[PDB]
């Protein structure tokens, strides 16, 4: 058996555990036999190339499947009535009524209705026909092939980079900030000015004419003259019909603010100046570090020099440079945390300030996008903490970090965990007490006895942004404030028009239910942070197991001795925190979907009166919106929601299956497999057939992971089916 060629210990396993553990440790290159650091970095570089190629192939596949089987050319003409098609259906297990019921979108074959929002994004950036969609798919296929060839090439001899090249922090930071962030943003601003804005104004720009069709009538002469404000003159009129010249302006760079009154999305000129400014700022950031020419900053000197002289941080940040450069897991945790924060930021800011034309009226698409990127955010943050725990297990050198900030985290880890526990118990005790209190007093016929705290802090913030609903009369809601007079000539009219109109999701009105659900969200975030931080900081050892770092990041237990040591590793803390992450994104998406459905229905008072107690959530959101989902198929017929009606139940099945690997444990199943081995060995006409690997029960860590996987898949598929089918049944 030589499948796990990277592990001799796994390859000598005589049982079925070998295949599973080779599958689960295949990409754990640091644990492989005889792995050196240079080989590790080169394999990581090529794997990153392969993932980039996979992303490009997926995007090219989306573009191609739309150019072939979509209705983009029909959808551009009538964006607010035509249902967008994701891809075609060819399933031979279908009966005829299922073929009939999925034939939508103005085509003659069964199709799925798109929820990804690629129509609005591609239409906003200037694609109009199916031809350029196919050309973009071809370009991304070619780009993916180029990156596959680069991944092969940069592993070939005399091209394999050295460890000094990989650990060049200053050069990589300068090039990735100035070029990968800055010049990419400048080029996207260029694409918006040169292509997207003219196509938004009904004038065709492609590769055949973009060198002869000026983005602005005055050309680049106002840019080279320093009369840049000429590019701000004659913006798009409030009567502008998107994709046509009727009411179109000539400006290419404005900061008008608010939304286009027809598309209910941000002005494209604002997006172009934003990405231009982001490019300029990032190129200015990308000249900061010294690479070859004496000027620039040194990262080691900046880290060592910022030690506060009062001694409250100890030695400050001395040794953090080598600890960060030498540990890929510390870097991975930092990157995953920052990525999770910004995809949460994307999820909040894109529903609140949409940039794609007509996507604010596509309720299913907004729900799917928010839910998707928020679940991605939870996964990324959990991964950040998990790989930080791996950094403490594998890479943390105390002797290189004497009196460091990391060492001082470790020296007051008990205070951190105890105060996290205190705030988690505080939040849970009083939030659950208010919710149960409201339930009990509403059930007894006295809703006037509820404890309803007005969220005056966030309402004050909304008034500071210009919301005149609450009468706070402060900052942008004050017509005499210095901020109001400062911004009155630039952006205040459009922003005030967008924030004080109740037709969008810009700073939606909030009440006691919003207060309670944000404090529940704070409870869940603090508790997940408690589990993850306690796992990371106790990863090296505890009072029950002071030599945990000798046993690695993942192991089942330390035996029944010393009272019992079940789930003591930091991997087990990851495993416990995954449920709480699913709970937190569940609460967030429940709040988002119920509030947005009640506003879209014109029945926001139902949310305002029912969200203060749990029975309102169970009845008016879960039970009430389940009716089109559970009627996707029935004894009277079926319709297009039936697949979600299947998938919903599918989730309710697979979620439950996870429980069996999380409740029942190993020895029972192992003895059953002994009985099955005896049965197969003693049965005639079947003992002629022999297994090559001995059948064994799944290991403890493997069973925890498999139960987690079935649980998580059920969670995701159940909520996705519910949100899409419910939004479609109410609004589509």
């Amino acid at each position: 058996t030589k499948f796990p060629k990277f592990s001799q210990a796994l390859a000598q396993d005589p049982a079925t555990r070998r295949i599973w553990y080779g599958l689960a440790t295949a990409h754990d290159l640091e644990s492989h036999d005889g792995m050196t650091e240079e080989n590790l970095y080169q394999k990581i570089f090529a794997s990153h190339f392969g993932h980039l190629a996979v992303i490009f192939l997926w995007t090219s596949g989306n573009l191609f499947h739309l150019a072939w089987q979509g209705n983009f050319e029909q959808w551009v003409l009538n964006p607010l009535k035509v249902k967008p098609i994701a891809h075609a259906i060819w399933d031979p297990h279908f009966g005829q009524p299922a073929v009939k019921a999925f034939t939508k979108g103005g085509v003659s074959y069964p199709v799925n209705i798109a929820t990804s929002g690629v129509y609005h994004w591609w239409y906003t950036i200037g694609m109009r026909s199916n031809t350029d969609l196919y050309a973009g798919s071809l370009f991304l296929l070619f780009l993916a092939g180029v990156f596959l060839f680069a991944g092969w090439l940069h592993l070939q001899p005399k091209f394999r980079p050295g460890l000094s090249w990989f650990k060049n922090n200053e050069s990589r930071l300068n090039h990735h900030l100035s070029g990968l962030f800055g010049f990419s943003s400048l080029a996207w601003s260029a694409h918006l000015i040169h292509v997207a804005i003219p196509e938004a104004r009904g004038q065709h720009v492609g590769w055949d004419n973009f060198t002869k069709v000026a983005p602005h009538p005055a050309g680049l002469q106002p840019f080279f003259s320093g009369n840049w404000g000429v590019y701000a003159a004659a913006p798009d009129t409030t009567n502008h019909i998107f994709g046509t010249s009727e009411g179109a302006g000539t400006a290419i760079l404005t900061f008008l603010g608010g939304f286009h009154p027809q598309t209910q999305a941000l002005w494209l000129t604002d997006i172009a100046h934003h990405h231009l400014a982001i490019g300029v700022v990032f190129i200015f950031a990308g000249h900061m570090y010294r690479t070859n020419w004496g000027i620039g900053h040194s990262l080691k000197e900046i880290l060592d020099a910022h030690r506060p002289p009062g001694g409250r941080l100890g030695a400050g940040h001395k040794g953090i440079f080598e600890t960060l450069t030498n540990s890929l897991h510390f870097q991975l945790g930092l990157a995953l945390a920052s990525l999770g924060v910004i995809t949460s930021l994307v999820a909040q800011h894109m529903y609140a300030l949409p940039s794609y034309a007509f996507i604010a009226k596509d309720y299913v698409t907004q729900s799917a996008l928010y839910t998707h990127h928020q679940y991605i955010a939870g996964f990324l943050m959990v991964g950040a903490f998990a790989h930080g725990a791996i950094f403490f297990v594998r890479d943390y050198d105390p002797e290189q970090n004497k009196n460091n900030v990391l060492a001082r985290i470790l020296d007051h880890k008990e205070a951190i965990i105890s105060h996290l526990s205190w705030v988690s118990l505080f939040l849970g005790f009083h939030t659950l007490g208010i919710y149960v209190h409201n339930d009990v007093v509403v059930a007894f016929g006295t809703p006037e006895k509820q404890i309803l705290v007005e969220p005056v802090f966030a309402q004050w913030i909304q008034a500071s942004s210009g919301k005149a609903l609450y009468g706070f009369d402060v900052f942008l809601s004050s017509s005499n404030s210095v901020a109001t007079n400062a911004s009155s000539n630039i952006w205040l009219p459009g922003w005030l028009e967008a924030i004080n109109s109740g037709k969008n999701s810009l700073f939606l009105p909030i009440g006691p239910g919003d207060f309670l659900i944000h404090h529940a969200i704070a409870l869940a975030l603090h508790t997940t942070t408690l589990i993850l931080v306690k796992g990371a900081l106790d990863a090296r050892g505890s009072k029950l197991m002071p030599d945990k770092k000798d046993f690695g990041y993942s192991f089942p237990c330390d035996g029944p001795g010393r009272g019992g040591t079940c789930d003591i590793s930091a991997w087990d803390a990851f495993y416990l925190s995954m449920f709480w992450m699913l709970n937190t994104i569940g609460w967030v998406t429940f709040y988002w979907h119920w509030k947005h459905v009640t506003i879209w229905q014109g029945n926001a008072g139902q949310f305002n009166e029912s969200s203060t107690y749990i029975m309102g959530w169970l009845r008016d959101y879960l039970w009430l919106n389940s009716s089109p989902l559970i009627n996707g198929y029935n004894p009277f017929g079926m319709n297009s929601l039936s697949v979600w009606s299947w998938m919903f139940l599918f989730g309710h099945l697979i979620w439950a299956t996870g429980f069996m690997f999380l409740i029942s444990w190993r020895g029972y199943w192992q003895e059953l497999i002994e009985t099955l081995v005896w049965a197969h060995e003693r049965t005639p006409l079947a003992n002629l057939v022999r297994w090559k690997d001995k059948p064994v029960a799944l290991s403890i860590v493997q069973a925890r992971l498999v139960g987690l996987i079935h649980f998580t898949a059920g969670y995701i598929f159940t909520y996705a089916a519910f949100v899409i089918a419910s939004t479609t049944g109410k609004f589509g």
């Binding site: 072939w68 031809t131 196919y134």
Partner: peptide, 30 residues
């Protein structure tokens, strides 16, 4: 709309990408 020849061109490019992906997988497998 898209024709048969365009789909065939996309299939040829995807086959080229398949060959390159197989080569990258063989290079990573040592």
């Amino acid at each position: 709309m898209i024709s048969d020849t365009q789909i065939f061109i996309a299939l040829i490019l995807a086959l080229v990408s398949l060959v390159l992906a197989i080569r990258l997988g063989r290079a990573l497998y040592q």
